[PDB]
From Swiss-Prot:
Binds 1 Mg(2+) ion per subunit. Is also active with Mn(2+). Mn(2+)-activated enzyme forms an inverted pppGp(2'-5')A intermediate, suggesting a non-canonical but accelerated 2',3'-cGAMP cyclization without substrate flip-over. Mn(2+) ions are coordinated by triphosphate moiety of the inverted substrate, independent of the catalytic triad residues. The gene is CGAS. The chain holds residues 161 to 521 of 522 of the full protein. This is Cyclic GMP-AMP synthase. It comes from Homo sapiens (Human). Its cofactor is Mg(2+); Mn(2+); Zn(2+). It is found in: Nucleus; Chromosome; Cell membrane; Cytoplasm, Cytosol. Changing residue 17 to A: Strongly reduces enzyme activity and stimulation of interferon production.
């Protein structure tokens, strides 16, 4: 695949400043309103907007992703069934009145109740109280996000998150292997930042827990993504222009297009851009030098990514970049047939100069 061809695709994928500014304006308004009103509850009084950038998320330009962080003080986690990613939330001391005490189902903080209250407050307040027309989508299966549709054209996913300024869980110890890439110093200062928790329940055979939370490091992902090169001046000049972000955009667009084409079937529904992002991070670990990401070698680099991703589909092994023992492509999460299907489609695309980019 020619580099100029891929860069022609990415060239034709760039959206105008107006289309971004308008939607960003509407979403900004709705988000500010929802936040200001969310602060009317004692539980969500300390709510706050988490800066994930709200951009570089969809390649779908009408889809946004905002995260509502909620500050919780000195929480104690309990790893559930050694899933390494899902935990129970407890509080060290509750003699002092706790805003979230209403959601306590014993000593364990109920995620489903918090999500229910959250979604209910939002559902009540979105009823045209603003000047914008907003509606709430149907409750998704096992999704922590509350999605809203604005003007029947804009999609906004709102995910509640508990912020813990404590040290990261032991399951993340062997994760974030960015030492040879972004230096151990940067890894150090990154792990000093807080970590988040989203209301995501874990699978227990033929049942669900609805009381567990999952680890989230979206802020860390944004940080390492926007500061990606080994050299501090990476992509700040003509001599040090790389193609990392370009590769990620291309991969995301590939998966997006394949999911779209095969929307009628349910094969590619379980695959998400996070699998792509994770694979990209692992390739970034494998190729730490900026010289391995030269722009003229785009077509090469991208291929590499593709190959690796396919491997992950073939071997059914995609470790979480922060939680190495958490496999995203386990047979328990995604069935073999779906990954074989996706493998087939991606292989077809790669072998035929990617006709799925032609749209
Ligand atoms: N908004 C949202 N936040 C979540 O944390 C989340 N977890 C699951 N789901 C949804 O549940 C269904 C089945 O599980 C899927 O439909 C899936 O939707 P999705 O298309 O995946 O959502 C894309 C974003 O959701 C995030 N991400 C998705 N998976 C994970 C994960 N395992 N760990 C941490 N974050 C994850 C990720 O940031 C990625 O970024 P982009 O917006 O750029 O695509 C989530 N949806
Ligand atoms: Zn760069």
């Amino acid at each position: 695949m020619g580099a100029s061809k891929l860069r022609a695709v990415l060239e034709k994928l760039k959206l105008s400043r107006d289309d971004i500014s308008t939607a960003a304006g509407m979403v900004k308004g709705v988000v500010d309103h929802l936040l200001l009103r969310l602060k009317c509850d004692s539980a969500f009084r300390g709510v706050g907007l988490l800066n994930t950038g709200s951009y570089y998320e969809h390649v779908a330009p009408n889809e946004f992703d905002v995260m509502f962080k909620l500050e919780v003080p000195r929480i104690q986690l309990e790893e559930y069934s050694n899933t390494r990613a899902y935990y129970f939330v407890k509080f060290k001391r509750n003699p002092k009145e706790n805003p979230l005490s209403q959601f306590l189902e014993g000593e364990i903080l109920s995620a489903s109740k918090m999500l229910s209250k959250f979604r209910k407050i939002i559902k009540e307040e979105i009823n045209d109280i603003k000047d914008t027309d907003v509606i709430m989508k149907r409750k998704r299966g096992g999704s922590p996000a509350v999605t809203l549709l604005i003007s029947e054209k804009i999609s906004v996913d709102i995910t509640l998150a508990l912020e813990s300024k404590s040290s990261w869980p032991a399951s993340t110890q062997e994760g974030l292997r960015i030492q040879n890439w972004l230096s151990a110093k940067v890894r150090k200062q990154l792990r000093l930042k807080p970590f988040y928790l989203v209301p995501k329940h874990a699978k227990e055979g033929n049942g669900f827990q609805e009381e567990t939370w999952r680890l989230s490091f979206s802020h860390i992902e944004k940080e390492i993504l926007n500061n990606h090169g080994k050299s501090k001046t990476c992509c700040e000049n003509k001599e040090e222009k790389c193609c990392r972000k370009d590769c990620l955009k291309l991969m995301k667009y590939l998966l997006e297009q394949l999911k779209e084409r095969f929307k009628d079937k349910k094969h590619l529904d379980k695959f998400s851009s996070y699998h792509v992002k994770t694979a990209f991070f692992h390739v970034c670990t494998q190729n730490p030098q900026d010289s391995q990401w030269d722009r003229k070698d785009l077509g090469l680099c991208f291929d590499n990514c593709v190959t690796y991703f396919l491997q992950c589909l073939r071997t059914e092994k995609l470790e979480n970049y922060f939680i190495p023992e958490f496999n995203l492509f386990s047979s328990n999460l995604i069935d073999k047939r779906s990954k074989e299907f996706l493998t087939k489609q991606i292989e077809y695309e790669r072998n035929n100069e990617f006709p799925v980019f032609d749209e």
